[PDB]
Design a protein around this ligand. Sequence first.
Ligand SMILES: Nc1ncnc2c1ncn2[C@@H]1O[C@H](COP(=O)(O)OP(=O)(O)O)[C@@H](O)[C@H]1O
Length: 349
Amino acid sequence: ASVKVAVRVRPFNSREMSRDSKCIIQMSGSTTTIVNPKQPKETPKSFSFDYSYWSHTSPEDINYASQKQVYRDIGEEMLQHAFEGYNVCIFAYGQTGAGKSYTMMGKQEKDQQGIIPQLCEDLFSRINDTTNDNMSYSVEVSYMEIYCERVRDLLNPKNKGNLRVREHPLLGPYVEDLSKLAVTSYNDIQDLMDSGNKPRTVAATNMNETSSRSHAVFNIIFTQKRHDAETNITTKKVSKISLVDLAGSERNINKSLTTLGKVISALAEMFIPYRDSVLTWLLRENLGGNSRTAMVAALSPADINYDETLSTLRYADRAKQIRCNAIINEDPNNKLIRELKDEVTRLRD
Ligand SMILES: Nc1ncnc2c1ncn2[C@@H]1O[C@H](COP(=O)(O)OP(=O)(O)O)[C@@H](O)[C@H]1O
């Protein structure tokens, strides 16, 4: 399968309104067009994605791409793939202020919740709707920040540790001593998300908002346990769901962001510089390995952001060419069960 790619243009923000910005983004069907406001004579550049989300107006518009609509396209599809037993990844990419955090986290005030809360609510709603007493489940959450190549645990802020990223000699990269907490309700996972969001690194340069240079990775380990009555074997399906709010794409400590660009470019071109940054190392499987992966590229509508928005569209266009190699998590015991059961009914006959 391919990396799925959506782009999303937001309303003007305060900085843009301040400079009487005009809109340089047009969307129709799956295509996004960007005009060059500095060379108005040159022909607009057009790009085709899995989705082009027009969120430039307000939810009063019939044509406004809502939080619900964005979730119901990519978020629901990836949660369904996790239920099938695939590892899944959604990452939000783009310039500072373009709408990565709004898309991934959103706000609680007025159905503004983003992909992460909607997926968590959908996950627990599906688990709690289970009617088969042979199905049992486990949900483990981890939430980390990568800032200047240092890893912090957002679920245990009293660990000023800069957790070490390691390659397991057989099982691939992991964050040594990163909290992995069992959660049994949507309320519990929401409180951890909220607490984790508050522990993110702030910067004076961003008026003491969350640093524009910090990556946030939200991971769920979803374990589905099927109890077989006849055999008493329990089969396990395990899926890792990685929901990523990247550092701002604009332009040592931009190592991760710059390396992600080279990784996307090298994967689109198909050596691969995964290990040159903590982000691309930890997300190696999600960037062309054992994962179903989607990119949501946030776009400023404003003339003043032409060059950065064009760069986001070109990286999004390249991500579309990446192939993944996701396999279903298979318990070998599923075959032992089928055998043991045939062998017994046959004797019983
Ligand atoms: N689709 C959208 N509709 C409405 N407001 C949006 C949308 N996307 C972003 N915003 C708003 O734009 C501003 C910047 O978005 P934000 O998510 O903080 O950007 P980033 O995380 O990319 O730096 C915020 O005030 C946010 O609420």
